[PDB]
Amino acid sequence: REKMFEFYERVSGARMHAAYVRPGGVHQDLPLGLMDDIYEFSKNFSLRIDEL
Amino acid sequence: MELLQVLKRGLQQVSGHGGLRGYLRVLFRANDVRVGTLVGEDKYGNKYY
């Protein structure tokens, strides 16, 4: 969860209350390199679920 | 064999901090005894690793 707050904070600047999704779309574009890091989180997340 | 290497790394930390006196200073001030590359220093005395 801490790592996913880092994805909120990188798009919006807030770990929780981003206020990112607004009527008409979103406030700012994804910063470069974010999707690569989201892929890394997703690649290793199923294992964390299995441990649970 | 791996254990012996690990123990060497634990003693090189003591020398890398300037000896036992330096090693203990950081242990009690910082609760960490890792040794890192000095990126720089500021005008107030803080060191960055």
Partner: protein, 95 residues
């Protein structure tokens, strides 16, 4: 990553999974924290001709609600066609 080979085996055996391939601590595979400057695209309305707002004004295309009835042998109907039964997943029907 700094774990000795014995410890890697011990925790791999106990867990039962190759934990060193999918470590939960990020190392050097993350993106750089300083990135090249972007250059973002422009919208469909960034045009110098044939771009009158009266042709792309959604707010002004909204109309007041239609009044179907007001106090002021048909076949029966449903609010919408009956819903379609779902199909079992072919990826993994049963967990």
């Amino acid at each position: 990553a700094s774990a000795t080979r014995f410890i890697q085996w011990l925790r791999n055996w106990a867990s039962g999974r190759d934990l060193q391939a999918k470590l939960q601590l990020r190392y050097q595979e993350i993106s750089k924290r300083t990135q090249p400057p972007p250059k973002l695209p422009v919208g469909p309305s960034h045009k110098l001709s044939n771009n009158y707002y009266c042709t792309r004004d959604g707010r002004r295309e909204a109309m007041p609600p239609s009044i179907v009835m007001s106090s002021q042998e048909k076949k029966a109907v449903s609010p919408a066609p009956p819903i379609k039964r779902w199909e079992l997943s072919q990826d993994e029907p049963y967990l």
